[PDB]
């Protein structure tokens, strides 16, 4: 049969000066289930090292330590953690509780790592705290408890996963006489109930509370004797404490890891706020710059949209003056448009003049732009008729006073729902009857807001301007033919048709393309400058997480001792970083949205802010990725701590 | 006569639940110089509270406490610190040493806070450490010392500033039996030497080391009896330890505050690196963006300086399509420049043609752009002659083969130091004699880097091109007399000479002004976005400083008890932040300079990086201001800590 704790020729060496020093020197030691063992020696004796090895927090480097038959010498971290969850509970001189949790929570932690039903572990935690006289202090934080009360909490914690072997490191060293007596009473009562208890001390008067006293000095055991305490006659057991013992639970520990990181945020609200603030400012500047560049691009493009697709505009305008010295040189005339119409690369053509008059209806007045155009103009610019129809070529010839109106003029003058078609409006001093309504090119509520009116160019030229010439001529190029080659043909045709190079062009597609390219490139560079800010925010996240790993070093050690896997610690800290970056990426998005409405109020007619939902999604994802990347390094550093050095980190 | 410590009616209340609780209930107590006093009681007794008041770390809050006649009831923090420096030394259960310093440094700290000569305090530190058996461990850090060794370090520390009244709070509570014997031996020997010692404990067997035992319970003193230790027979005194003891010095404490901040940076090197890194990225991005916008503006403007000042260039339309359409439609001819010459607003005028030929010298060849210009061209464009002169008007008439060169061609062909003037070079197939060298308009190279040659336009048109027309004509407007009106007048005149409006103009000053304003505006917007990054860096600095205040809370408390003023603490932390941000600004500047040299390797001849020295200085100042500001709140929070709560922070 196996003895519960079986040590054989245990040698623990440490390197010291291109050589070694033995701290444990060939220790043989058998401890049976139910013994009350005290191991006593002074500083330097090796009692600590021995207990660390006994608690599966360290490995021999020479010898054998079998826990219920299981050799620990060659076990890997999660296997030793398995043994700690299975057979050991720990009590520390300084009563290492987790300041952020309640007594109940600290008691639960080992059951969290062992994968114990949360309802059942709640029951067990409050039951053990009540059994040890802390039934009314269940919800107190460690900062709300006295030393003895905290040590009683950690006794209940040690009992959570069974309490098979309670390893107690000088429990009565920090706290006073009375509460030391109480702690020792509890331990002896647990031993009476069958709990194996190993007490490590330097005060023989503490060791005398045990039934077996092993004395250690300079790495070797020098005494091993039974003992009967004197105070067993006073402390009669009038309060009979007898309380001995691929995809499933990973989810439970992930839920708890989220909860734990969340509580660490609630504990340090200023720190959390500042770190999130850095991420909020970063994400907000990136989403803002991107939406500003996109919306401004769309706005500038709509301001071009008064031109068509495959549209070549033929301008010639310049300085003003007399009829004989300026008008005689205005060679662009509608006969030129008639000539262009017959070219194999021209699918549509329209002269274009314009004037601005006061438009009247029953009582309304409003200034409006009256465009003198061809019946084909709507075909050139791609305008869509809402209700009516265009001009007849005859009505252009006959100087008709028919008129086409856009959506904006309908809103201005026919807000009642009165059908504009057939209604006579008055343009300055010229009456005109509406024969059609056009849906504009504009994309946006307040991106255009102008009143466009369309009459035959012959009528506007004759009745309103008194001129024989055209402001410009728009041409839509056939067959998707090379608009540039058609452009050159137009320049040669009109130039040969005129007496000289009296014209210049505007290629709508070329200008649009240049605007898209230039605005896109500038958007990319500037939003990269914003991403620099976001990078600095991420660096801040990493630095804070690393520092909180240092802060929580002892918490990490305690969690390991109670049963945490390196995985579990990694998940805990990494989830903290991720949650911090997400909560703040969302707030950066919302801040950017509010700032977007601010700009959309106070901006001009070129600056506009438009938020693509995939830039919002990209913001959320890149915030989470900053959490995963920048937070990872600290979370791994926490997961890889030596629980011995962590427990004694001070 | 006055007793050293004179206590009367100490009542210490703390609020607890819409009421208060008395922790000291009217304590009277007289302690004379040289007494060895133990104050003993269990948790709740008030012994610590009493000892804190005795040490000038708290105020009676009701009653009187006189230290050598000085009432503490109404004293302000720095006055209580004065009393601590004057009369008190402190020893703590956990032997609160400063992990970053050596034993010697920890011993020095109280002398730093007092007005003590650094050399003399070094001597005292090593002397006291040698007296207490730490002569060979003088340089060890606290992590390199045992509990007893650290406790002897803090004994020497308490003795540094005199050791008048040594308050020891459970000194033998953390450490083992043997080293407790040694600590108590040392304390008794100091008492024999005359030191007043007040020992506070809960273990009567420790209290029995004193000669006077005052027992306290539930806030009141219940026993006060003399005592003779049992070990007075053991200690025959064979080793007689008898060692009893704003413009001027503010600068010395500033030196020490700088040194302490520096050592704290060395202690946490990764933290320092990351915190500094944020500022480095911020300052580098801002200085980089500013230098990029400024230099690019200078480059793009240099490409315009070739258009001269107040110069209106008369360009002409394509005019091509055929060789016969070139002959037909190239209406801009040098006679038009002759006509422009006579106008009242034209001070100088030049036709301009250009072609590219291979420029040859003795054996050297390089392709060069030959500009056919008027003798006035240099006045219009504002070019300055380095050595020679321009053409004669006669030589323009006579189709002269004179040539003027720029500095780039001088470098290409006359690198020897050979004077180009009088030398005959060959341009394609036309020889030409150099009559002058011209210094260009440009500052940065960018795209030019071009070989410019100037010959009479009549000669280039006649001999090299075989054409009757001019590419464009430049005019310099006198007095700046309505250059915009001159543009229109030129168009009207040239249009009147031709058969149409077949010419257009370009106002050099308008273009320059537009470029200057637009690029300047882009510089401000983008560099503001970089400053966003710098802001996030500062926020990170603040968060880190708050965290290091929390981390060092006990260090702050120990410093206060040892004798630090709130001033001293604030200076310490403020200097830390300032120093980190200052260095991060310097490194941000150096990174920015390197990045500028990197950018200058890019293929964009429009992007250029120019560093103003006032943006470097601005970087230094704004980095230091981030240090002071963010930067400040943590340092004040450190200075305003309650030294009692700070010392008991865990
Ligand atoms: N890294 C390391 N390096 C060198 N020596 C070590 C190390 N770790 C432990 N030891 C030794 O084990 C003992 C630890 O606890 P003990 O209870 O025996 O005395 P303490 O004062 O440390 S509580 C101590 O006496 C040390 O001499
Ligand atoms: N903020 C505060 N609030 C309420 N009560 C306080 C407070 N501070 C001290 N006290 C009391 O004074 C005593 C402190 O030291 P003592 O040596 O007498 O016992 P300890 O267990 O704290 S070492 C302690 O027993 C407490 O009951």
Numbering used by the authors:
A (entry chain A), B (entry chain B): 3 to 247, 260 to 664
Quote what the paper states about this structure.
MacB was purified and its crystal structure was solved at 3.4-Å resolution. The two NBDs are dimerized in a head-to-tail arrangement, and both subunits contribute conserved Walker A, Walker B and ABC signature motifs and residues to form two composite nucleotide-binding sites at the dimer interface. Electron density was observed in the difference Fourier map at the expected position for the nucleotide-binding site. Although the shape of the difference Fourier map is not optimally fitted by the ADPβS model, the phosphor and sulphur atoms of the bound ADPβS are clearly identified in the anomalous difference Fourier map (7σ, 0.013 electron Å−3). The binding of the adenine moiety of the nucleotide involves a π-stacking interaction with a conserved aromatic residue (Phe16) in the A-loop of the NBD. When MacB is compared with outward-facing structures of MsbA and Sav1866, which participate in alternating access mechanisms for these transporters, the overall structure provides a similar V-shape opening with access to the periplasm. However, the locations of these openings are different. The cavity in Sav1866 is present in the outer leaflet of the phospholipid bilayer, whereas the cavity in MacB is present in the periplasmic space.
The envelope of Gram-negative pathogens, such as Acinetobacter baumannii and Pseudomonas aeruginosa, contains unique tripartite machineries that export noxious compounds from the cell. Here, we present the crystal structure of MacB, and show that, by analogy to RND transporters, the MacB homodimer contains two large periplasmic domains (PLDs) that enable the interactions with the other components in this tripartite efflux pump.
